[PDB]
Amino acid sequence: DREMLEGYLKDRLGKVLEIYPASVKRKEDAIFFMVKNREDGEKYLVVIGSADVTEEFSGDYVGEIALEAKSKVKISERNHNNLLVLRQYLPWLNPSVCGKRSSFGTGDRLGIATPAHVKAFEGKECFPFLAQQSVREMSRTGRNWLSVLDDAIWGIFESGYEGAFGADADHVKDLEDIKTAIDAGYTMFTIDPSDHVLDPSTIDKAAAEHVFFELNERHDFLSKYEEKVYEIGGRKYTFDRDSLIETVITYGKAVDHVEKCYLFLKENNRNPFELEVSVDETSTPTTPLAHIFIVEELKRRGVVFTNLALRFVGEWQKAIDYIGDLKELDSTLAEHAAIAEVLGPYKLSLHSGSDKFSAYPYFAKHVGNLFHVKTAGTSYLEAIRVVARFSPELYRRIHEFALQRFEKDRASYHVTTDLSKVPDISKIPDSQLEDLLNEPNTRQVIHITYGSVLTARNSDGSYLFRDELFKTLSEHEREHYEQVASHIRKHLDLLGV
């Protein structure tokens, strides 16, 4: 019985240690499970079995229990090395390349949301990317590739999931971060070339002339593409001189950067990987001609990629729904998908796709089974909703602090938040506080200030919210899980999977 394991541990340790029944695994003659301490919420690994298995873990022994010969009990902490050995014994706890099947990325800014994300994918065919954070997010939350992957795998171990998952090195720019991500075993690298994306509506004409002249002297794009026709499906696309000049000015050094990154990956990653190229940064929606140019330049240079992240028409602001003409969205999506199949095939990636419910149907029609969708912030928003539900004074303080940090934390993104429409909370009854994580502007304000709240210090050195927030989220674990899981499952449902 499980209850007699809990009683064995309690009598031999003096701690109420409750077993996640879904965590128990049995490989060879050994047993691995997770337990939660109901006093402080800390979680621990427990290994039950032979002499040499239990030896390869850093842990304190609790004695030998009759099993079914006697088996040693070893309680252990989830540091990186114990987790490495656990991934040896439970070999599904390792990230794997996704392929040309559809995928969904549930990024976790907090490191405690993976089991809920697992519950969301239950019953659905859609490759899950469970370890997904950007260099910027990890910079703002004090984490790294290793810690993000370890958190994701700890969550998987809790859930009991034995299926495939992925680890996305989101929005990487410089080769040293790529190298760190290679060392941590990540399976997809989403490379960002924005440092070299050149918005044509900002620069002076002369600078654009100079940049194009350099790129054309170095690569001679004119004689390769000028007046070249591309007959994709019904449509015919012609590289007229002007359109080609502006495509080159916008994307040339960016493609140089992406080639450099892909070559770095060929020279240094022995293990399998796949690659996502991000074109999301352009303010203008990506033209079909620019799509053609980018994919053809990547092919000509030998760059293997699996995911292309176009900047599609419309508005893609964080936390809120897609704004724009749904039928232009539909038609340009037909364009981009039809071109992707002839030039590839490959997957289209929807950066900042969290909560764009209206676009999903169009995406699940033309994109079909070759889609990727990336969500990280919405999980944090649902977590803050749980916080407001159970610690409303904490949410009140966070709300004021966030309204304050908003201006500095938004100058690094791109939103049209209407601060006038943020409800006045001094009147709102603690019961209704969660409901304003339904009002779009408050959604945005909470969304982009996550780093400030998560790292805000006091004078005496204490943290304003971090500790209280994690305590609250631990005390109400299944609440948190249900919220996050049901929202992500809303996503996957509307996406046709």
Residue of 168, 280, 297, 434 interacting with Zn ion (CB under 5 A): 280
Q: Which span (15-23, 119-127, 227-235, 251-259) binds Zn ion, by CB under 5 A?
A: 251-259
Output the smallest distance, CB 106 to Zn ion, in A: 16
User: Which region among 201-209, 288-296, 351-359, 464-472 touches Zn ion (by CB under 5 A)?
Assistant: 351-359
State the Rg of the chain over Cα: 25
Active site residue 355: no
C-beta neighbour count of 162 within 10 angstroms: 11
Total residues contacting Zn ion (rule CB under 5 A)?
A: 3
> Whose Cβ is closer to Zn ion: residue 105's or residue 440's?
105
Q: Which is nearer to Zn ion, 153 or 265 (CB)?
A: 265
For residue 115, the surrounding DSSP H or E stretch is helix 114-121
Contacts with Zn ion, 94-133, as mask; x by CB under 5 A: ----------------------------------------
Least CB distance to Zn ion at residue 287 (A): 18
- Give the C-alpha separation, 64 to 293, whole Å: 66
Site residues (CB under 5 A) for Zn ion, limited to 352-381? none
The least CB distance from residue 117 to Zn ion, in Å, is 20
Of 148 and 386, CB closest to Zn ion: 148
Catalytic annotation present for 276: yes
Pick the closer one to Zn ion by CB: 351 or 489.
351
Which part of the chain contacts Zn ion (CB under 5 A), choosing from 208-216, 225-233, 238-246, 278-286?
A: 278-286
Contacts of 111 (CB under 8 A, 6+ apart): 143, 147, 148, 151
CB of 162 to Zn ion, least distance (A): 31
Site membership for Zn ion, residue 351 (CB under 5 A): yes
Write b or e for each residue in 24-53: b if 16 or more Cβ atoms lie within 10 A of its Cβ, otherwise e: bbeeeebbbbbbbeeeeeebbbbbbbeeeb
Q: Which is catalytic among the residues 150, 158, 246, 276? A: 276
Query: Is there a contact between 394 and 468 (Cβ–Cβ < 8 Å)?
Result: yes
- Least separation in angstroms between residue 372's CB and Zn ion is 12
Distance CA(159)–CA(476), nearest Å, equals 17
Q: Point out the residue whose Cβ comes nearest to Zn ion.
A: 351
CA 195 – CA 349 distance, rounded (Å): 20
Q: Which of 25, 72, 257, 385 binds Zn ion (CB under 5 A)?
A: 257
Coil, strand or helix: which one is 469?
A: helix
Distance CA(358)–CA(348), nearest Å, equals 17
Angle subtended at Cα 19 by Cα 14 and Cα 21, rounded to the nearest 5 degrees: 165
At 437 the three-state DSSP class reads: helix
Q: Which is nearer to Zn ion, 64 or 195 (CB)?
A: 195
Instruction: Report residue 324: phi and psi, to 5°.
Output: 150, -175
**In this structure, what is the dihedral angle of CA atoms 191, 201, 340, 102, given to the nearest 10 degrees?**
50
Q: How many CA atoms does the CB half-sphere of 166 hold within 13 Å?
A: 28
CA 442/CA 399 separation, integer angstroms = 9
Indicate which residue of 150, 170, 335, 355 is catalytic: 170
| H or E stretch at 18 | strand 17-19
> Applying CB under 5 A, does 291 fall inside the site for Zn ion?
no
- Select from 52-60, 155-163, 350-358, 422-430 the region that touches Zn ion (CB under 5 A): 350-358
- Is 137 a binding residue for Zn ion by CB under 5 A? The answer is no
Give me the residue label for tokens 């409901």: 435
Q: Based on CB atoms, which residue is closest to Zn ion, 47 or 277?
A: 277
Which stretch, 201-209, 254-262, 408-416, 449-457, contacts Zn ion (CB under 5 A)? 254-262
Which residue number, 71 or 378, has a Cβ lying nearer to Zn ion?
378
How far, in Å, CA of 7 to CA of 240, rounded?
A: 77
Tell me the catalytic residues: 170, 276
Give the binding site for Zn ion (CB under 5 A).
257, 280, 351
